[PDB]
Amino acid sequence: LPTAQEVQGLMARYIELVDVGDIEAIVQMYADDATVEDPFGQPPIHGREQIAAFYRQGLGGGKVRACLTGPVRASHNGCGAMPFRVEMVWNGQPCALDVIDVMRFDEHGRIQTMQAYWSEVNLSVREP
């Protein structure tokens, strides 16, 4: 499993990929059998193909940005959690959404599970 430092690097890279919107690069970070729960509480997304469609829907449209708003917290069992902000335009309204992603990586350094904690209480109208 990736070391604590490696997890910090991997999770930070993920945010960089989301920020630029490189869908294919994001999908490649996931294990072909990964699961995504975003927002946490909803039915999971299973596998590369479904995950690709998920990111294309979320990042393939209007301009979206993402940035860490604090350091990645990493564990010694291939897991980590990170706080970040996502910016987007919702029907003309400039918005910001605060999120925390928790990830578990496998022995190949790929994301096995991702859980995104957030809800409408974390949304707000704000200029980019």
Ligand X SMILES: C[C@]12CCc3c(ccc4cc(O)ccc34)[C@@H]1CCC2=O
Which residues belong to the active site? 14, 38
- Least CB distance to a copy of itself at residue 112 (A): 15
38 binds, among a copy of itself, ligand X, none (CB under 5 to 8 A by kind): ligand X
User: Alpha carbon of 70 to those of 76, 81, 85: distances in Å?
Assistant: 19, 10, 10
Sole window of 15-23, 27-35, 54-62, 64-72 interacting with a copy of itself (rule: CB under 8 A):
64-72
Asked whether residue 101 is marked as a ligand-binding residue, the answer is: yes
47 DSSP 8-state letter: S
Q: Exposed, middle or buried: residue 27 (CB in 10 Å: 0-12, 13-18, 19+)?
A: buried
- Least CB distance to a copy of itself at residue 115 (A): 9
Q: Is the dihedral of CA 55, 98, 45, 25 positive or negative?
A: positive
- Footprint of ligand X (CB under 6 A): 18, 38, 58, 64, 66, 86, 88, 97, 99, 101, 116, 118
